[PDB]
Amino acid sequence: AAETVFKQNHAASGFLAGRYDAQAMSPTMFNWSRESRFTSTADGALKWEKNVPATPQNGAGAAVDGDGTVFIQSKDGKLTAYHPDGTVKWVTENLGTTYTLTPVLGTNGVIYLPSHDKKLYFIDKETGNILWSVPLSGAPSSDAAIGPDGTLYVSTLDNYIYAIKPTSPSTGTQKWKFKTNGVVGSAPVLASNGTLYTATYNNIFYAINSGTGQVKWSKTTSNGFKGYPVIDRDGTVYAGNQDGNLYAYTSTGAVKWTFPLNGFSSSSLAIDHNGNVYIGSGSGELFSISKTGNMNWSFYTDGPVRTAPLIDADGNVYFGSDDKNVYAVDADGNEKWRYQTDSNVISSPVLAEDGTLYVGTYTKLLAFGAK
Template identity: 35%
Template sequence: MTILNISKNSLIFCCMLCSYVTPILAAAGNLIWKMPTTGNYISSSPSIGHDGTIYFGSSNHNLYAVHPNGKKKWQYHTNGEIDDSPSISRNGTIYFGSFDTYFYALSPEGKLLWRYKTGDLIRSTPAIAVDGTIVFGSYDGYLYALNPDGTLKWKYKAGGKIASSPLISLDGNIYFGARDWNVYALTSYGELMWKYKTGGIIHWSSPAAGYDGVLYIGSFDGNLYVINPDGTLRWKYKTGGNIGSSPALGKDGTVYFESCDSYFYALSVDGTLKWKYDVQNTELGCHPVIGKDGTIYVGSDDGHFYALNPDGILKWKYETKGSLLTTGATIDDNGIIYFVSADGNFYAVDTGTNTGIADTPWPKFHRDARNSGKMELFSISPPHLIIRDVAAGETKEKILVVRNYDTEPLNIEHITVNNDRFAISPNSTVIMPSDSILITVSFSPVSMDEQQAVSILHIDSREIPVYITGNPLSEPKQVPVRLITRDGETGELMPCRIFLEDSHGRFILPQMSESLQNKMFFVSPGDIEFFVFTGEYNMSIARGNEYIPIHNEIIRIQANEQEICTIERTLHRWIHMK
């Protein structure tokens, strides 16, 4: 390999026949560098450490550590192929398995810390829990949980080989698939909570999850399964081929995955097809990754690496000389995407952006650049807030619940929203460990058009989106109203005459009415119920049989969860104009 001095903004072209180098501008889809290995194929998805070092395994039995400029940092040799993807802990320890049946822990310098022997080869990428527990599967059918020092914490026997990589949820539960056709859910102690049987083996497809705990996983029966946290089926989508691809979730809940029927799919949250793109894939499928700008990146066994816009239109593609089989890519914070190919090369390609992986619940295989395989230690519920039945000119509120699952305080630095029809309070706060706070979101439409917004919660320097939909009333809604009037001196119910006008000056007559000085009114004994449509009204009240109103105000009648809208007023003998 010719090592070049490369930065993000300038590629260096090395002319082997000349004594100088010429910088050329980097652009989307252009190769920055590639690193050959001696392996005849690579199917390990790369991970990125805190210092920018990239790690991946190869069929030549080596785990590689590579500097961001493409220069090899070190390599570590095992006695078997490395087909899984390395995961990196918070302290920089690199975990991975090998076909030699051992599971390895290396220091950031490439030194062996420990290894643990299983009963068969390892293809499952490890997940790392909050307490440092490492969880992975083996072809011996066991899911292993190891302590950070390499000792066994527990193991669980599934009904088949495990190549699927486990997911650790916010509450510490563990989810994975096996070749016995089942999706498993275990507690953090290794106890079975439930299992769900699909129609085929689950091989490389590993689960993705939303903030609501819903799981997404593919099966060799051609279905993408969407499973509720309690193990019941929410929906499934049938494709024309096996699914070995691990799904990724977009900001709006779109599910992205590849099938062996040649297509890459985008499904809505309800399981309907948004679009599909022919990537010429007929083998096991690659794992997609979503960039912060919404671009979806995925490889194919046709040798191409594809960049697709969120609407399914091709943005660019890069050709390698081998299949991109069962692999996934990752993106660094400078917008460089890294992936491997069966041609034996490791690639760094410019995405044309200066940003990394999308801030979604599950934007790629094993979730983040470190391949941690676990959900974040906070939840926002609901992830998509819908405020319904709000009349124009009115305001309605809903609540977001933000919970901190961590042992450290969670800092919400500020909250933004990109639509002035919505307001949020408070706009900053700190959530203590194991606590939650309520965020009020209000919607004030000015028309009958549906409103969409994205609210960004800036949490510990991360941008977490919450999607908001405001649905105004398509037509006024009739609601029950109870009006109580009391005498200000005695507190007793006070009979009165009520004048109720809408915003157009029309009198509202829910009861038998009378006319007074060309104004219409209805009579109340002091406690009356009637129906009116939602909206804004001018209400005037006169005592008993008197003619002059002693109370006047604007009232807003809104649809709400209460059975009846109750208005109570205490009236004095003097005129009170409000």
């Protein structure tokens, strides 16, 4: 257990509060504001590095529990639990290859990991033993988002949104399922009013009632949305589109505004307690954009920014780029430090209680400790 509990929301965000491990330091990559409640004095000095070969979907990465244990999947079928000092705590194998997702930490020590084996794994966080699995009709294309009652929402590659009850195979596991029109590119996120949001590469944006699985409203665009959106207190969805614009939709489906990214959207989003939203672009920039759609600042890198940015309690923003640099910037967009590595930084950063920053590439998991 950690000092303070994990919250999905600050005053300016509007995600649906789900049954996540409130005692963990970072129990989920997305479906939360991505503004850490922790500060960090990390100055860019590498604490350690491990070889974690991965191809994470939409910037998936590690999770950290209350004890500081770092859980991360590798594309060799392994789910590894690391102690804070880099030594292995346990390892479970034969869990799925090709693609990597985030091991989401639910209540009662359960890790929820969807597997390319077309299974949803219930894994004990303490030992790494598989409690049971739920079969999926297709390969999963998203992390597991957890509802208030523990329902798990994932998208599958055969064009479905699945609502799975967090129960043993002794009962029916399907709360509902929704056949989507096209390949899901925007993974399910959930808003305070109970709406689930997703989108497909047939250019359809869905607002789905997460209680019944019925479509509230939908919109088509000229191009497809990609990544995990963020939601503000008013229920407005901010989502990056491959046509080069960040869209903002109100909860009723009205277009609040758009902002041009000078390139295809390349990362999922973050929202701070002042209502600013952050997104990376294929143009190489990491944008900070106000709630009214005005650009606060733009940090330039030499490659597409695919890591979903992370904000700490002091307003510093951490991310990585396809120029193979890990970046830390202050709340005004000025560089604090950088770190050159051998592979593209694509696995979104995570912050531990003591300010240790974990971030990953295609080959390595990195750890930047305190100063």
